Structure formats: C-alpha cells, structure tokens
C-alpha cells in the first residue's frame, strides 16, 4: 500500500502543480494586452492541453495503475485518453518552437505565415493529430482483438490493453522522436545563428541599435529553445526507452515498478515545466506573475 | 531621405568651447550610431568617436579624448559635439556622419554639410 | 593602430582612360571603404564592404582587395570622376582613414 500510496500523492501533486501553473500562465496572458500575440497564444493553448492533463490525464492514468476487474475497452479507452491529452501538450510544444523558428529565421514572412486565424488552423492540425494517433487502438490494433479477471474483463493496466508494437515503432517514433529531433534541429539552427551573429558583432565596439536587438532576440530564443528541448527529453525519453528495451529484449526483467512509476511521474512532470520555465524567462510573464500575487495579498 | 543638418560656422578665440549640432530626419534617430569626423588643413580625415543614440554608450579617439564630447537629444532626434579648450590646432571642418549596418557590415551612410571653427584672437 | 597609405597621392587621367587606385594598409583588414570628395563639398560613401557601390554611383566603379592591399578601378575615366577619393578601415579601432588621392582631368 506505501507503495500505490506514495505513486497516487505524487502524480496528485503534479496534476496540481500543473493546474496552478498553466491557469496562472493563462490569467496573466487575459489579463495583460501587452502580452497578446501568436507566441503567447500558443503558451495559452499549451497551458490548457496541460490543465486537461493534469485534470484528466493522471487522474486517468491513477485509475489504469489499480488492476481491479474491469471491462477491457472501457480501460483501453482511458489508456487512449491519457494518451491524447499527451500527444496534445507535445504537439502544442512543438508548434511553439516552430512558431519560435519562423519568428527568428523568417522575420519577413512571421507576420504572414502565423498571425491570423492560421495559429488556430495549426492548433487544430495538432489536435487532430493527437486524437488520431491516440484513438488508433481503438480501431482493431489491441490486445482484446489474458486470464487476468476473465470473459472480456482484465485487470486495467497499460500494458495489459495496449500492444508494444504500436507503443515502440508508431508512438515513439512520430510523437516523442520526430517532435525532438524537430526541436533539436530548430534549436541548433537558432545557436548558430546566434553565436555567427555574435562573431560578427565582436569586432566592433559601440555596434547599432538593429545588431544588438538581433543578438539579444536571438540569445533569448536559443536559451529558452535549449532549456524546452533539454526538459521534454529528460521527461520523456525515459519511459519510451523503457518500452524499447521491454519490447526488443525478450525474457529480460521487466523494469522493476518503483522504475515504471518514476518515468511515469516525469512524463506527467513535462506538463508542468513547461511552458511555465519558458513563461518565467521572459520579464513581462514574471512582472504580471508578481503583480497578480501581491493584488490577491 | 536621409538627412543631417548641422550647425553653422564658429569664429572663436583661443580657450572657449563650441558645440556643433546635427539634425537628423528620414530615419528612426536611434537605430544607428552617429560618428564625427575632423578634416583638417584639407585631405586630412580623421575619426574623432561615436555614439549611440539609443542607450548612450560611446567610444572616442584616444587622441581626442576629453578634446570632444558626444551627447545626443532622443526627444530631438539631434546629436551635439562639444570641442573644449580650443587652440588653432582644432581650427578645422567638422563632419557629422550616420553609421548604418546592412546586416553584413557597417559604414558611414550619411555624411552632414559640415561646420567651419576656426580658432585665432 | 594601423595605416593607411594611398597611391598615387596625386593624378591626372585623360577622359576614357582607366584609372586604378590602391590603398595600402600597415597590417591585414577585412573591409576597405571608398569615400569620393570633392573641393567645397562633404565627402560621400562611394564603395562600401570593398565591392559593393553606394547609391547613385555609376556601373564604371569597381572595388577590390583583400589584406594589405586594397584598391579602385574606373573603366573609363569621365570628367565628373574628377575628386579625391578616400579609404576608410574599421577592422582595428581606431578608425583611420588615408591620405586621398587628388585626381585631376588632364587636357
């Protein structure tokens, strides 16, 4: 029980660590005009795909860690869900560092390529992407296409209703490898800028306002893109990694349960650290942060 | 258009000070650093500093260090150069020019009238 | 610092003649400016980033160079060209410029 206990206070803890973090991210965006546009708009829709997360996703996948008896589709429905809601906050992740690319690398067309109703189309793009990667077990590609409880029930537990095919070539690959590898080429793209910017600006002494402005956008933008990349692998490639090695390695020992929890509970610790650690490096984010605390005092 | 205005001529006497203006229109005033130059005799082009409109940072001649000084008016969209301690060596025209950046490099764009100081009693 | 040594300090070129100018710099620079000025007047930005002209100047100007030696050519010599022309450095601060080359018309 000490065990299950201690699982259950920590994923709580960061369902309501997320909630606290991405509502308040979301009331300082409302409250501030100066902090209205296409970038916060897609921290805003991150917010709330973690919001959803921590009210629905762990709550979720809290109940798929018990193995009571129950009806196999019902559990793999739920296992779809939290797999949904996850999908969600890393597309929304990644349109942010594309929004971040195009902002930096393509200043001319920025103002054409995202602004307008396009952040919605690319936000619902993202969406039905996570639906349709996440509801694909559902259409056949399931264990229950075994005698845990018996008679179409089982005991609900992750791997018990998802097949490890799925969970290793279709959603490793395309949702947490394609997604970081994009994330790890943009913010590459962005340090070389940067530090070739720098290079240049080395030689002269007293350099103009356009220059410093230039390195200064794109610094900022290598620091938070390097900060997001390092934290979504350190979250997440943990307990994809374990998959991996549970489905190429046969007869080896299944990852002891205390190494299944701790990837679990930093897979849900993703959608809390971000996008608030991105929200806290900008000065405007923290300034409104502070003065929505002392008006609440 | 890009231009910049400066003041006119200075007739001054041995020990004053001047202070030579330069008006700029036809571009955001503090985008780009604003350097002076100092002809003197003819042929004889010399860079006496810079400055930055936008958060004032400026860096000089060690030649001319303490002989000029730099200020600027963001309100005004006006750069100011102040020659102190005047002898009948400063006695020269005095330039005032707009260092663009074209992304790639940089380089004196614009270049002012010019201003006469002659020094004598 | 560094110095800048033009060559020929003074010329005179017939009309259609081509003209090359050179400007010797004491230790390496990256970029070599052009400035054109003429008597009565405020110098103005000729060739800039040693290749590229400034607006409004005409197709017959050319720059080139690298390290020490830079230079300016004209394809052929026009009557207007008549100035003195200036090399500015701004690789090693302070900025220097040269000594000009005055280059008159011949008749």
């Known amino acids: 029980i000490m065990g299950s206990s201690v699982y259950i206070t920590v994923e709580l803890a960061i369902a309501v660590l997320a909630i606290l973090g991405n509502v308040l991210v979301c009331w300082a965006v409302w409250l501030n005009s100066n902090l209205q546009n296409v970038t916060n708009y897609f921290v805003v829709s991150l917010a709330a795909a973690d919001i959803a997360v921590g009210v629905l996703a762990i709550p979720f996948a809290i109940t798929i860690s018990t193995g009571f008896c129950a009806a196999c589709h019902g559990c793999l429905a739920i296992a779809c869900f939290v797999l949904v809601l996850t999908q969600s906050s890393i597309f929304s992740l990644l349109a942010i560092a594309i929004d971040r690319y195009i902002a930096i690398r393509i200043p001319l067309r920025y103002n054409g390529l995202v602004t307008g109703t396009r952040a919605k189309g690319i936000i619902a793009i993202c969406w039905v992407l996570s639906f349709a990667i996440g509801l694909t077990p559902m259409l056949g590609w399931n264990n229950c296409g075994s005698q845990g409880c018996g008679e179409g029930q089982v005991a609900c537990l992750f791997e018990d209703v998802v097949p490890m095919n799925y969970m290793v070539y279709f959603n490793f690959f395309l949702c947490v490898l394609v997604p970081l590898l994009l994330m790890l080429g943009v913010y590459l793209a962005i340090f070389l800028a940067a530090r070739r910017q720098a290079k240049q600006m080395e030689s002269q002494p007293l350099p103009g306002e356009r220059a410093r402005s230039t390195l200064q956008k794109e610094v900022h933008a290598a620091k938070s893109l390097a900060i997001i990349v390092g934290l979504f692998a350190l979250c997440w490639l943990p307990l994809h990694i374990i998959n991996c090695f549970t489905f190429f390695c046969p007869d080896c020992s299944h990852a002891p349960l205390w190494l299944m929890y701790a990837a679990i509970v930093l897979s849900h610790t993703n959608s809390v650290v971000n996008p608030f650690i991105y929200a806290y490096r900008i000065r405007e984010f923290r300034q409104t942060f502070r003065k929505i605390i002392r008006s609440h005092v | 258009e890009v231009q910049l205005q400066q003041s006119g001529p200075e007739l001054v006497k041995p020990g004053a000070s001047v202070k030579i203006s330069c008006k700029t229109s036809?571009?955001?005033?503090?985008?780009?650093?604003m350097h002076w130059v100092k002809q003197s005799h003819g042929k004889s082009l010399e860079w006496i500093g810079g400055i930055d409109p936008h958060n004032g940072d400026t860096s000089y001649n060690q030649k001319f260090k303490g002989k000029a000084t730099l200020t600027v008016d963001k309100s005004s969209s006006t750069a100011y150069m102040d020659l102190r301690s005047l002898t009948s060596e400063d006695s020269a025209v005095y330039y005032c020019?707009?260092?663009?950046?074209?992304?790639?490099?940089?380089?004196?764009?614009?270049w002012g009238a010019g201003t006469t100081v002659t020094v004598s009693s | 610092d560094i110095v800048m040594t033009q060559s020929p300090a003074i010329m005179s070129a017939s009309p259609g003649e081509k003209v090359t100018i050179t400007c010797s710099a004491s230790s390496s620079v990256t970029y070599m400016h052009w400035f054109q000025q003429k008597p009565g007047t405020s110098p103005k930005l000729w060739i800039y980033?040693?290749?590229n002209l400034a607006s409004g100047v005409p197709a017959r100007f050319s720059g080139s160079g690298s390290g020490t030696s830079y230079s300016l050519t004209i394809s052929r010599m026009e009557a207007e060209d008549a100035a003195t022309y200036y090399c500015q450095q701004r690789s090693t601060y302070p900025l220097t410029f040269g000594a000009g080359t005055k280059l008159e018309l011949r008749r």
């Open positions: 980033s040693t290749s």
């Open positions: 020019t707009r260092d663009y950046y074209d992304y790639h490099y940089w380089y004196f764009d614009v």
């Open positions: 036809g571009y955001t005033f503090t985008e780009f650093t």
